[model samples]
Target: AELRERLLRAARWILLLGLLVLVGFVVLAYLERSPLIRAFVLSAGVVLVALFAAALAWLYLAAALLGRSPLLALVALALGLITLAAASAAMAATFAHLLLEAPPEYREAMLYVFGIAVLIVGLLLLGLVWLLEEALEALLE
Candidate 1:
């Protein structure tokens, strides 16, 4: 119960952060003249907004089912933690490679690699919330 409430609260902040990111993307789209850059920003903004909404809904629904099944709750929490750990590990590895292994000439390309790493982490974050929601729904009435 407590854990669910905490998770819900955290989700609220994350949603707010998502909105901020969306605004930043919108601003970038407006400032950029290139059609391709504008399109990328718009698409990315839309995705961030959608992910935030889905996560908020999932957290609320999961909270409602928190007390219905203890095992499911535990499993959902475990999966969330595991997903977080995996994303963190991936990010760490990417940063380590960029900082330690890549040459100065290759550093420019590594920026693109970092962007891809961040994109993967964002998707994994969404996946974590989704899996928790699915788990709770599957196990509870």
Candidate 2:
């Protein structure tokens, strides 16, 4: 069985189970007249958690499309690098904020780091795609 199919089925079944259990809880609450808020709220919270897991499983199946286009793979992975750069810059900014005035260069240095990352990835992306195109021609020829 393909992993994607199994993941999709698991996502579906888990979602159904969460819905079923929540329905049972709602009926049970109504059965006892003036049922406790805690029981109903907790049931909702459990259902929310279960649904989150189900969505996660389904998203895994959704992401499998990244493999279909090499350019899309680069686009997704390159954006990941951008996020990493942004996160690093933000954390360093926090460090700069914490200090009264010790080596305020952390903020500036992080910008340089991110710039370098972007530059390298930008060049590498161009080169790699060009090479792939050339290889396609060379292999066929």
Candidate 3:
């Protein structure tokens, strides 16, 4: 039973990760302005998605250790992670548009603004992940 449940949980994670990879690829393609940017975005997206997915996986593991069934824990984690990803992506796109890809004269100001936005997003994600971890710990104890 435990093995079966573990397998199912892993499969769910794989599906989610696959979806994220596919979407990330599409976004990278769309963001690419030229061959060089295309290659760079593709590579960067691959790396970023992997890192993000790993973080999510760690959150799940923590949940599992806390005594929540993998499936339930995974479902909860997925919801939070997806929400975070959406917000982060939005802010990231806006930052890119208003800063790096925007006018040159206001580049510094735009970059700073974008940086703050991204920082806020990063903090939110971090806090959510931390909360999930804590919840899992409480469940375990």
Candidate 4:
């Protein structure tokens, strides 16, 4: 019961952080002071930042709260991280395209979104491994 309560509290904090990031994104959009292409890039950065923050929060919470060998928590947390990582990578790729002499077709946008989604899942798995390691370290102490 205590462990469950701790996990719940940690989840709440993580959600709050995610919400805050959302609010920040909204504020940035309101500013409306950039070229169309630049705006897209900036917006993408905000999204990636929010996702990364959420993933890290989950990873840390899982390590600190969830019990019972940390297996379930690790898996869950890692999944989130993997997702964020993939999105980050995709965003990087999109920016790279913009740097080329002639940007590829706008179809790249769809590809970017789809590719990043898959990467996010893989990133989640990686994050799980990372959280599991943290849990093990804590247990050793």
Q: Which candidate tops TM-score? A: 1
Residue-level lDDT of model 4, residues 1-141, one tens digit each, is: 233355455445546655664554456556544444335535654665566566656656565646556656656665665665666666656655554533455334434533543454455445445545654565544
User: Candidate 2, which segments miss by more than 4 Å at Cα?
Assistant: 37-141
In candidate 2, list every pair of residues with a backbone clash.
none
Cα lDDT of all candidates, in order? Answer: 0.59, 0.42, 0.53, 0.53
TM-score of 4: 0.47
Regions more than 4 Å wrong, model 3: 1-78
Tell me the tens digit of each residue's lDDT in model 2 across 1-141: 232354346446646655665564445456543323334334443534444343444334335643564344334334443443454455345433433243444334333433443443354334324423432344334
Better of 2 and 3 by lDDT: 3
Per-residue lDDT of 30 in model 3: 79
Q: Which candidate is the best by lDDT?
A: 1
Residue 48 miss distance in model 1 (angstroms): 1.8
Q: How accurate is candidate 3 locally (lDDT)?
A: 0.53
Cα shift from native, residue 9, model 1 (Å): 1.6
> Lowest summed lDDT over 10 consecutive residues: which window, candidate 4?
101-110
RMSD in order of candidates: 8.2, 16.6, 8.7, 7.7
Q: Count steric clashes of candidate 1.
A: 0
Please give, for residues 1-141, the per-residue lDDT of candidate 3 as tens digits.
243254346445655754675575557577645554454445445544554554556455545554645446545665756665785786578447545554565565445445544554575466446544534564554
